[PDB]
């Protein structure tokens, strides 16, 4: 609703949290096909090489 | 070892999997990973991510 007002597309950050297996990841892709944005998963659990 | 080398390093060779795919010559073999329990989980690049 806000993107519809202030002209162009805009980014923003969000966070989800809750017990595992609630469907978080599933909604991600569903939103991506809602807005028409492309999806790209990127795990970083336990990573340490900033490079 | 699971991913080979860049091919820009001297002596780089493809990771093990390409060799298995090259050898069995099928697209759908039955790979058998062994001893998952004992994967060397070190600082030197964690296979468990790989
Ligand atoms: N309320 C729900 N609505 C839609 N899908 C659900 C719901 N609850 C569970 N799921 C299913 O749970 C599975 C795992 O969800 P996902 O977030 O992808 O993985 P995880 O739950 O491990 O984060 C998905 O296949 C998804 O369809």
Experimental approach: cryo-EM
The count of C-alpha atoms lying within 13 angstroms of the C-alpha of A14, restricted to the half-sphere facing its C-beta, is 6
| Nearest-angstrom CA–CA distance, A33 and B42 | 39
> Is the CB of residue A18 less than 8 Å from the CB of residue A24?
yes
Q: Is the CB of A7 under 6 A from ligand 1?
A: no
CB B44 within 8 A of CB B50: no
Substitution candidate for ligand 1 out of A23, A34, A39, A41 with most atoms within 8 A of CB: A23
Binding site membership of A20 for ligand 1 (Cβ less than 6 Å): yes
Close Cβ partners of B16 (under 8 Å, ≥ 6 residues apart):
B1, B2
Calpha distance B9→B6 (Å, rounded): 6
In terms of phi and psi (left: phi > 0; alpha: psi -120 to 50; beta: otherwise), the region of B25 is left
Q: Which atom of ligand 1 is nearest to the CA of A23?
A: 17
């Amino acid at each position: 609703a806000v993107s519809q007002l202030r002209g162009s597309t805009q980014g923003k950050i969000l966070c989800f949290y809750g017990p595992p297996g609630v469907g978080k990841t599933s909604i991600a892709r569903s939103i991506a096909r809602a807005l028409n944005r492309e999806y790209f998963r990127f795990s970083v659990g336990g990573m340490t090489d900033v490079a | 070892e699971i991913k080979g080398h860049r091919r820009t390093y001297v002596g780089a060779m493809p990771g093990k999997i390409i060799q298995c795919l090259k050898k069995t010559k099928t697209e759908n073999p039955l790979i058998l990973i062994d001893e998952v329990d004992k994967i060397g989980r070190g600082y030197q690049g964690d296979p468990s991510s790989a």
